[PDB]
């Protein structure tokens, strides 16, 4: 009835979502700086120029992280602050490096373990323009590999590294539906982008293990999102299979090559030649390139097989992703995110799914949290109340606990998304995911919500001292 004492817990952000200061200390433009410039791409017509101004408030956030009793903190490095043009032949920005080097020292001094994300969607614009960015099988993995190397040298004190955050998003949403940067819409390119992300990952991991890992006994891994699935009609085997295939398209897409050494068989049979093949060199990079499994999880769905054959523009694996099953049952209540409905049981099920499929690897839950329906349109100290979010964390974390203590899922860490309300990409600022209310009307004042303080006693209970 107790998690291990070295179980890390805390909060998670991303650079472009909280930092602001986009034109500070020589930061180059990312693809998201340009994406937000396009009218209609962002719902509230906003961007991350100010965000939470966390670039300027490192002492304030660190103090907040302490206030809530965080043992760890997951954040991302803005690539274009380190190398403004991104490439392995481009000038390196020391002021960018120093800003993060000082941030790590400030965390270490305040016993908060940094979990660092190398790439959180903010690819330097120059790389996109120079050779096609993520789409380029030859150039991008080499540039990422170098950028990883640079950060490994720059931050010797950091022992917890993440390569890519949610490559599924960068590929499907960035190149399929075009809802995320760079906003391309293709039936072929997402599957090419996904492949490149994998190779870049493998390249960075090898460099880390060979030159930096044994320096301080660290670990590196990729972060994969994925919502669990249940048959829309469990009496129909086509729905049972659909629900499984849907996980394969979402998650095993990246994880099967990293652990098994090849793409899921189900993906190869639908996509065919559109799905790339690993060269020996590429496979040698990708296979076994996880020290730990980085996991993002938010919700679950009912999956209904489709009667028609898979279209060219399909990305979910020829299925219907629903919130009601055939009997009229509902996944969970309505949130501010039409795609997110609470389902704590699905959290534990995904944990066990991963464990069974990949021989029970070390798992870090790098993201977990919820939005709240109509949260942005209600009074201040009523935002500080967030019983809905409190309940979300209570049940989800306890579901994770069961997964660890009963099933024996090797989860060593949990990070709540997010430390505070921030730029929710295409949703803008309308959608709040934070446990801390950020006051944008009044200079991003930090006001912790009821859920923020609820995480300390919850984890106090579940961890063993």
Residue numbers in the entry: 0 to 464
From the reporting publication:
Our laboratory has previously reported the crystal structure and biochemical characterisation of a glycoside hydrolase family 1 (GH1) β-glucosidase highly expressed by Trichoderma harzianum (ThBgl) under biomass degradation conditions. β-glucosidase (EC 3.2.1.21) catalyses the hydrolysis of β-glucosidic linkages in aryl-, amino-, or alkyl-β-D-glucosides and di- or oligosaccharides at the nonreducing ends, releasing β-D-glucose monomers. This class of enzymes has a critical role within the set of enzymes that compose the enzymatic cocktails designed for plant biomass hydrolysis, thereby alleviating the inhibition of other cellulases by cellobiose during the reaction. ThBgl is easily inhibited by glucose. The molecular basis of glucose tolerance in β-glucosidases is not completely known; however, it has been correlated with structural features at the entrance channel to the active site rather than the active site itself.
The tailored ThBgl (ThBgl-Mut) crystal structure revealed that the selected mutations mimicked the active-site entrance of the highly glucose-tolerant GH1 β-glucosidase from Humicola insolens (HiBG), acting as gatekeepers, as postulated for the HiBG glucose tolerance mechanism. As expected, the mutations did not affect the overall tertiary structure, thereby preserving the conserved GH1 (α/β)8-TIM barrel fold. The ThBgl-Mut and ThBgl-WT structures are very similar and display a r.m.s.d. value of 0.28 Å over 464 Cα atoms, with each monomer being considered. Moreover, the predicted catalytic residues E165 (acid–base) and E366 (nucleophile) are spatially conserved and thus not affected by the rational modifications. As predicted by our structural analysis, the mutated residues W167 and L172 function as gatekeepers and affect the positive-subsite region topology, narrowing the ThBgl active-site pocket, while the −1 subsite is fully conserved. At the other extremities of these residues, the conserved W338 (corresponding to the residues W349 in HiBgl and W339 in TrBgl) delineates the new, narrowed entrance to the active site. The L167W/P172L double mutation had a significant impact on the glucose tolerance and stimulation of ThBgl. In the presence of 0.1–0.25M glucose, although ThBgl-WT showed an accelerated decline in activity, ThBgl-Mut reached its highest levels, which represented an approximately 300% increase over the value measured under the no glucose conditions. In fact, the catalytic efficiency parameter (kcat/KM) of ThBgl-Mut is approximately 5-fold higher than that of ThBgl-WT under the conditions assayed.
